[PDB]
Design a protein around this ligand. Sequence first.
Ligand SMILES: [Mg+2]
Ligand SMILES: [Zn+2]
Ligand SMILES: [Zn+2]
Lengths: 128, 916, 239, 286, 446
Amino acid sequence: GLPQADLIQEGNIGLMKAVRRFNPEVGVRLVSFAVHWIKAEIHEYVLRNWRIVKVATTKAQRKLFFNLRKTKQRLGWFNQDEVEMVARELGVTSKDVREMESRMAAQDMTFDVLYLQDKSSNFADGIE
Amino acid sequence: EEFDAIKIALASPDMIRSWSFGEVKKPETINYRTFKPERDGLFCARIFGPVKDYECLCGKYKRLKHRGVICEKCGVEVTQTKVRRERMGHIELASPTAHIWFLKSLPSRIGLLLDMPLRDIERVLYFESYVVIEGGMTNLERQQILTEEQYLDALEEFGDEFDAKMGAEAIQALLKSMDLEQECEQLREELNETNSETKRKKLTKRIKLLEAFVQSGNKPEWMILTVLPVLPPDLRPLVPLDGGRFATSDLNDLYRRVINRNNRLKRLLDLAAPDIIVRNEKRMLQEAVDALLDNGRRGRAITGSNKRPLKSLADMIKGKQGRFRQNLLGKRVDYSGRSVITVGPYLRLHQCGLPKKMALELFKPFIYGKLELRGLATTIKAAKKMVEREEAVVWDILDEVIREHPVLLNRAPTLHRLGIQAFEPVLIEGKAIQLHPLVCAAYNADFDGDQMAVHVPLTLEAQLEARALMMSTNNILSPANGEPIIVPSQDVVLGLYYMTRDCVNAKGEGMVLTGPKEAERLYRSGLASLHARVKVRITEYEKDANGELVAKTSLKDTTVGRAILWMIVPKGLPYSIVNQALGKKAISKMLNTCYRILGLKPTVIFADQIMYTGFAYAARSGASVGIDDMVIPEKKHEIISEAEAEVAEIQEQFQSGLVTAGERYNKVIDIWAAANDRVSKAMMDNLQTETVINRDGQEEKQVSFNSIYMMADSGARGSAAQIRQLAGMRGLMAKPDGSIIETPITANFREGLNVLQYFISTHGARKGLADTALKTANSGYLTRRLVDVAQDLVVTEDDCGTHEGIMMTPVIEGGDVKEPLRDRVLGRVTAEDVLKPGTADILVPRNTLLHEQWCDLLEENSVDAVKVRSVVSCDTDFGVCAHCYGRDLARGHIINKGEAIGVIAAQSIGEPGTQL
Amino acid sequence: GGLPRVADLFEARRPKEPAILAEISGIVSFGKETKGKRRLVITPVDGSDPYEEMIPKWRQLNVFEGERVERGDVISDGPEAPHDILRLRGVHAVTRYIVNEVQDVYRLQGVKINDKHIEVIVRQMLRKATIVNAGSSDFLEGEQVEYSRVKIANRELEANGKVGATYSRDLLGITKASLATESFISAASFQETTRVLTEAAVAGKRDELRGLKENVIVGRLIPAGTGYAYHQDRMRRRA
Amino acid sequence: KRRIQPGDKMAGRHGNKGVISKINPIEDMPYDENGTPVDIVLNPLGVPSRMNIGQILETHLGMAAKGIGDKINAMLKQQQEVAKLREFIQRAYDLGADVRQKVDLSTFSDEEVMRLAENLRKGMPIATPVFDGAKEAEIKELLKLGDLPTSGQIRLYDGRTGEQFERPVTVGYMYMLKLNHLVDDKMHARSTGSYSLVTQQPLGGKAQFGGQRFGEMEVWALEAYGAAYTLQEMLTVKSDDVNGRTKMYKNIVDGNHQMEPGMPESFNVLLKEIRSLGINIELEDE
Amino acid sequence: RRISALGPGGLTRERAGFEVRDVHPTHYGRVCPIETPEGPNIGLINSLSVYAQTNEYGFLETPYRKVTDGVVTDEIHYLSAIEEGNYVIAQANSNLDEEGHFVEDLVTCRSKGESSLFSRDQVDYMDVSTQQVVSVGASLIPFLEHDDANRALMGANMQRQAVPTLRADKPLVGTGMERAVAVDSGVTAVAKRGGVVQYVDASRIVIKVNEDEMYPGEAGIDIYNLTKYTRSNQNTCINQMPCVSLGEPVERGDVLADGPSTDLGELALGQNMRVAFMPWNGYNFEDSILVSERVVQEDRFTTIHIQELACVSRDTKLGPEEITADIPNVGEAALSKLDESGIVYIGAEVTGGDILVGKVTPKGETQLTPEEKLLRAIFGEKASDVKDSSLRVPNGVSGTVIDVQVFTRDGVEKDKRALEIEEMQLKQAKKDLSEELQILEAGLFS
Ligand SMILES: [Mg+2]
Ligand SMILES: [Zn+2]
Ligand SMILES: [Zn+2]
């Protein structure tokens, strides 16, 4: 859901990094060498801009961000048994799997319901 | 805090930098794990302020004693958390960007200043073509649009001498290079030279703009942004929710996009990138800035998750949901309530029924104060507990609090000022508000589910204003035309009409009575009926132009009911007022005469007594409605038969080619209209009268006592047009396109319609319902426009030295005198003399307020033309004078200074807009 | 009609078939001919200007050749725009026209409203004026300025016995008249906030607190009713 | 459980709706010759201008049906034999002018007839289809069968005084409905509560303990009246003057009805937004 | 049965003209002309007619009777709006004979979008009923033909806002459509197969199916479980009550239990009231209604309303939340209605402020002024690390507790009260299965 123009420019910076670090004597084409740099810049941009707040910061969270999309097959929450199976392969704890599962399905509402109320505004209680 | 005016001007980069408390450098908002602000982000506490009262971010200082310390670790000042609503930031732009308001808002200011087409400026700004900034070898001149191929041709031949750029930097250089005074001189010269008028108009617009820039002091290059201010964080909230969700404003997303693209542009510029990628990044930065300032103005609006466009800064302050109309011209208020309204038939005109629970909730601080004063409670908490438990002393305290404390009642929509009135509360049980029946017409309220709002004035001045201006007893005349606004209707009118009717052979006819008290005594004991014709000794008083009342006793020919009703009439009115069958118009004339002769308080008392008597005798009458009260005339079948025979004759005449189809259709319509008129006349003739035997044993005729006829004739409710549908014929129905159907509905609601007739009739009902549902918005829009245009006119002077005016004459159209002179000159002030030797006219000196007596004097003689002063011809600057306006229609005397007549005029014009 | 007719009347919308009117007295005559143009060269009794006029050839003309007409006369009868009435027959004529036109619509439905309200609305509609020729005054020619400002300028120019400015009076619809006020806050709060704010910022305007809406917005006492004395006292202290 | 009270909304099936205004004692209600009072009293004025006569016809037919049911109940209370009940019920079911329905009680057992009579002692249900309904003459015939006046009007007496009303009154039975607009869910009041995050103004809605909206039209009305102090009170100390409302509360608790108004927060928000738009706007001192 | 013109791919309320909102001649028999909202959606939301169907392409069609040689043949064809415009269709009010001929020489008919008078030999079709034009709601109004269209629309709109009362009362004057509405709504229990009522209870009915309707290898008993005092979408009461007795024979399609606003299988939305038409001292002013106290004493318009409240225990940064009966800073008076699990007893009477579910939360560090700390130390009360976060009754709300539901995570172990609830459910299931087990074992032993 990110703009296409922003993704293209992120890859362009990664392409320049590979060009600056290219050894012609290896004999491989620059296309195969630069594919790792370009996709690394795009991945970092998606993590920081997919939501209003960064979803994955630690090492374990980043691994689960790109794997839970494919591992998840049926809508809803994982049962207890499915947590260990996911955690065993990726080398993460059961706490991380459940925490990232909640972060994936969260939908952010727009500001316009008990969230518009200022919780430190009741002056009558303070006077009493 | 005592400002005198508000000033607006352009903002320089230095001013924007002076506003800010720091620079936002990172596109981060908060940490997901701990809801703490990120450093140098859009919510940074170092820039905008602490998140908690008298605390720093890390937590070293946590007390008020450290009022001004800046923490060495976190760098956060230790102050109040409310400063986050006032502190702004700024963003340093890597490349200049144009302000979309000064570009796309027609007429374009940048284009007019540069004398360049808007399309060329748009092409240059969004990196599609070049523009010449300085001359080369004279092949290219300043402000010439070079295409990429033309730029390639020019660069190789002319060398580096000429300069051409792309984006906002070139336009900024062009704006900075200009000198305004020489341009003004040249424009003035060639304007004096030119002969074409369109060129003159264009150049006078350009000169206006240039002189505006010269006089204002703003610099032309300030329309290109180099520093971008940032809204304080508390005006764009970001609050966490339970299930890992957040609620956020779109401004955060727009700011993050702008910051991201600016940082990427800086990184590319520091990386020695090729020109095309930097050009693309600059274009995207310009697009992001344009979207932030005003989203939906140039192209596709940037959308969010719900496919809806993001709300920008400009959307916050414009529209029906913007700051102005939603929060500044109208607000939600404390000390208010709302409940369903019911009718109270016992209340006096100045009283309303308020539920006990509503009053208890509304008057809480007053009860707390009076509880503390009496010593029954020492703290606020103890009074709160006592009120919550609802002890008996709280009710007495509330009864003391509400005494002589008026409240305001309001019903939406408020079309005129009579929609808000003050009443003295009376505490009742239940949860419904009780309303006096006589103010329903002013409120346009009926007891079928309507709700009304309650407001409590707080200060002494507000209470005095309510009592002196907004009390119901002070508002009895309409401010639009001066007619009384409290008119009895429905049950009261029917009761009085039934009270004041007469019968030929009623029980007790022929007696002679000593007075109204004897008549009441006779009626209550069942000896005589209300409709008996008798003779009564009646005493009536009259003012004799000296201030005193002179009695005059005599014997009158009247009825028992009229004599009984005479006991409530105040002293000073003739007996002829009540010596007739009283309808709605008669009651209105009674009230108007009472107001004219005696005043205001007697009028209020008389109205209350009239309402009580009308209700009582309407209840005693026992009027009802039955299926037999709708008498169908016996000649209906015969008339319909003749109409059908004539229609068949016309049809046969058409079948032989003698008459065309359209003439046949018109003749059928005419025949059916005549038949309907005949049926209606027969119905009304049958329903109008009845037979009765008198004292001599011979038959007589008199007005009927039919319930439907009585209701229609008294004017309480109904009209002949509805009786025609009830017992005569429905008539001719129109097609949805507006054409008249050949066959009318020959049945009525008593007989019952068939399927086809009802289906035909549904069309007009739906059309009328749709028109009623749709005209209100147009009426409201017109009222808003009138109020806005007329809001600032106030009477400011007692008298102006003008002598002019306008000529007032009666208006006649088609030979019918539509409006007489008295109703057009009543309350005005004469511009010139009226004595007029030669016409034998009345001696009326100049500057005379035309009173009712002067109107009568002008009426008796033959006068057809008078000059009166008008507000259009007033000679007062910034307002009008009292004499040119005339009479305050709501009060009756001359208008006082400081009255907002524009709002009153707009409301008076707009209120009946829903009746068209 | 009904409500749309009143809205059209108060917005000063020109009818699609305006009636030609006599711009000045003088003998009428027919002049040159074009594809669809019939000239109306007029010889004044004392003037010289043969003022021509544009007339589509399908519209019948109700004046012969060679007779004299007075100012405000009707040519090619039909609906008449209030602008021509104001320009030729004056202010009272257009006031009477508007009042009668509105009162006919309100009378058709049996609704009674006093004329002074409509007169107030018309007076608000008659607040502008353009300087035709300025003498001793410092007023540009062809610009639109407030009429009361011109009155005050002429009154102060009567000192030393100089000559005032020459002006014509404008008629504006309620929307355009309200959008042309001297206070940008009220105009911005009414309609078209972006344009008003942009023009005010470009012009560098300042707004005194005079109207009711401005004081309501800033939360002060309105200069009417019980606040009139307070505002008068504040003005006295400022003076 | 919720019981009816003044303020509740009631309505029929003919577009006639209203709000309960008073609960009257039983002895104050109008009563007939036999002393049985009426349950509900409606204004006859509403019928003519709205032109809904179906309610009157339904009232007459309901009175006829209740008379039939009362006769059946009277027969049941006297322990009469089954044959007489059969005859009377067959007479009731045979009334009409060429109706399609045929009911033969000769194919009913005694227990079935007893059950049917038990189910009929509160009134005989009658079906009248739309556009194929019962005529007025049929209604009068059924009224005759029930020993009731054919005009549908009877004499009533005032419960408070015992005096007879001067004209006959239409009395009968009509089907009434209680609508989902209860005054229990509509009454709301607020003294002081919480406020919004940005505008610092009270919220809306009963569920949020919000306040009433004082819109632009009410401001226009107040300006027309000329009550400047009331307007200023509604604009600053009641809605969004943060210090003003606290000082007002403290003053009211101390019995000093005095006001010190300030500047609304929304104006500051507007100024901040306009400044964020890159435009320099400020308040000029003097 | 609602038809709307809004939604995706449809019109817009603000951008709709008068033409699309008006009644069209083709609406006859397809769309009810009087049932529509009275607000800004007046012409955009409609109701389906009683007999209207949809064609295979999605076009509305209505049934008609075919007349041949002046004889109505009692055969029915469904005609679309296009087909019906080319025929002469007689009204349903055209009186006939026993063998099916028109009485009058001239009969009123519709043709080419208009109505006129036609001879008996030109007729091609005839309406099937007088109910063909109105909707379901409009067909329940007696004497509708004597009512104006506007008030008929208002009554039709108001008829569906009625709240069911404590006891259902049949209407004395009806139209005959109540039974169909009540049966087709599905709020009542309808016997699937005939038989004899073997067991009847306030919440359970067992039917012994006749052997002619049984299957070879089944016990042939039908069990109906009734819903009792359940919440509706509008916070009203849904309750079923049986209308059959022990031993009564039943047939397929018969009604066994009555739903809300139903009386013996007939729709019953209100009550029969004795009404008098007269003014009474001003209490009838402007549509007001005066009601006797006997109506209140008999509870004829009393309604039951049910409200639901929830309490959630979550995980916090400081620590998890707990549901318990140990709440600090509250005396034993408040904790009297709580059980050992911290949940209010079923059947307790509660008012505003009462505690329903007890819960505590971690609180963390706090700041206190020295004077208050010294007062606390003097009074001797200790400092606690938890804060009360219990679920309380909102102010202005009272009532009786009639049901409690407890949900727990799979990993978390169930508490006592949820165990009791599941034992009750298991007992119900065990009885339901034991009926069949007993009857089958009795058959085997026989
Ligand atoms: Mg109403
Ligand atoms: Zn710190
Ligand atoms: Zn004057």
